[PDB]
Design brief:
Chain A: It is found in: Host cytoplasm; Virion. The structure is a homodimer. The first copy, chain A, is built from 1 helix and 15 strands; from the N terminus they run ββββββββββαβββββ. Chain A is mainly beta. The complex binds a molecule of 3 linked components (GLA-FUC-GLA) (2 copies).
């Protein structure tokens, strides 16, 4: 039976699975005051993708499709295509197109477009507000606010590349743990990856944390994912069968050979540590995770 | 001795190692008429990174540092930090900071900045022209043209996120993906490059992993070919499997029929060749993937592609 493994990449060598930016650090904190239900970076240890999770680190929070100008505004409606430009299908049993942002906030980036005939191209700063009434990606359309009211053409391939977040009380947006309504006010979310929470006394989620670029105002730029994108890619390929519900990982300093801490990688795809309170883990930059064994549901971790 | 493998990700499931975008297809063509010497997406099969290649798919063509306004213009000088905000050391024997663009062209994206003190933020459209005299990343500084003349502060962490390429003149004449920038500008010559690559077996051509860069203005050449998917770079770096010869034979397989579409040579020094003459967009099943089959000697003749 094929042995389970995690990548030996260090934290700084890996990518956030909820936004296309590098991981910076490990963070643990209490999460009782909210619902932890991200839809990107969701994958089982035996390699089944969940929620809106797809395999590309650079297609996260991107959109593709065609655009139509909204008269008398600087806004454009995008009718979504799939990430490979064929028709988008709302009957596929996912919450939204794969890689759709999984938090409420205003994401700024650029809309770019190519005219098929002559290869002319154009690019404009654009912002999508995932909390607004027009954010209905599951229905196949979303709205952008842009810096132009006339440059974009109809019936031409258009891409949104995310860059960062904006805010207009400080750090009151984005809300990284609030899911958008993928069908807007017209419906409720469907086929979600489940909420996650520690269930063992003294345990907290371990988050893989990045700082999103801010493009305006005073945004909350903290972004926590449950699994590095490289781990999603790894499990997807390996598809190693899980021999219990909990994989024991040791975080190791490869120079000293010493274990810094141990943690539980849950089969359904998230990590817990034995700690209480908010804490930025102190780790050597060469540190990495090592799978050591499958353990039962009642395994007591050495305290972090 | 640890068995060599390549990832089983399909072409469309992988990332270009020369720009932060998905792979779209496989392309082969003659390359005798130019120098194929990209510096990103360069890695040996036993996992040694070469040129400016680093591990992050999202740090390719990104820059980090602090900026200074150039008075009376919309331009800024960036003093480069390393990708983890450490000092960049120009005496390090690499061509340029890891992830530096390895083509001459105008790259458009956004410059973003956070004021440490109060967490105030700002973001502006910006372009870096890697062929310009002020593009000297090996010296630790580059220049951006931006949409602002006053918003960016000094002494604050500033990041450039690449989006696409622009062209300014003859159509599709820029960027020039096979022309390396002069990393030290007019002040010095490029050093410590990953070697130029070329087929050395009769009837062989390089196999390219191809993407289409977003275009942001004008009529750019948006074709971007890399020698290795970023996921292969990551895979070899981790595995560090010893090469048992200079050439690994790969078969590209249709996992449904189990049938081989073509075979190719993955050279130990990190690039792929196929037996074909002429420009050709490979036609492949979307679920097709590469499979390492054996190390072969220097005299192995590939089946025609
Ligand atoms: C906190 C503040 O965020 C950003 O400023 C925006 C404003 O952006 C506009 O004005 C600013 C400064 O006046 C700047 O000229 C920018 O190019 C321009 O778009 C504006 O959107 C208001 C809304 O009324 O919100 C903020 O004040 C940023 O530019 C600043 O540097 C600063 O971080
Ligand atoms: C081929 C052309 O490329 C882009 O236009 C640019 C120009 O961009 C400027 O003008 C356009 C109006 O066409 C637009 O207002 C844009 O915001 C502005 O920056 C300009 O850079 C010239 C240089 O002289 O080159 C191109 O004409 C694109 O916007 C067009 O749609 C078209 O594809």
């Amino acid at each position: 039976s094929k042995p389970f493994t995690v990548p030996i990449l260090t934290v700084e060598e890996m990518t956030n699975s909820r936004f296309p930016i590098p991981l910076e650090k490990l963070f643990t904190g209490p999460s009782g005051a909210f619902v932890v239900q991200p839809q990107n970076g969701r994958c089982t240890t035996d390699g089944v993708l969940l929620g809106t999770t797809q395999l590309s680190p650079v297609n996260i929070c991107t959109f593709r499709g065609d655009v139509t100008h909204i008269a008398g505004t600087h806004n454009y409606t995008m009718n979504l295509a799939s990430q490979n430009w064929n028709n988008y299908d709302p009957t596929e049993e996912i919450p939204a197109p794969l890689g759709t942002p999984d938090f409420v906030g205003r994401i700024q980036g650029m809309l770019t477009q190519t005219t098929r005939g002559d290869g002319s191209t154009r690019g404009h700063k654009a912002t999508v507000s995932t909390g607004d009434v027009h954010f209905t990606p599951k229905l196949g359309s979303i709205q952008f606010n842009t810096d132009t009211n006339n440059d974009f053409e109809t019936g031409q391939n258009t891409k949104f590349t995310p860059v960062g977040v904006v805010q207009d009380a400080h750090q009151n947006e984005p809300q990284q743990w609030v899911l958008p309504s993928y069908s807007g006010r017209t419906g409720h979310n469907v086929h979600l990856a489940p909420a996650v929470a520690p269930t063992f006394p003294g345990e907290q989620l371990l988050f893989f944390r990045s700082t999103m670029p801010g493009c305006s105002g005073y945004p909350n730029m903290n972004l926590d994912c449950l699994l590095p994108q490289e781990w999603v890619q790894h499990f997807y390929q390996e598809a190693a069968p899980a021999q219990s519900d909990v994989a024991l990982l040791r975080f190791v300093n490869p120079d000293t050979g010493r274990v810094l801490f141990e943690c539980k990688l849950h089969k359904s795809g998230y990590v817990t540590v034995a700690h209480t309170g908010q804490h930025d883990l102190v780790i050597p930059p060469n540190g990495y995770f090592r799978f050591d064994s499958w353990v039962n549901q009642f395994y007591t971790l050495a305290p972090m």
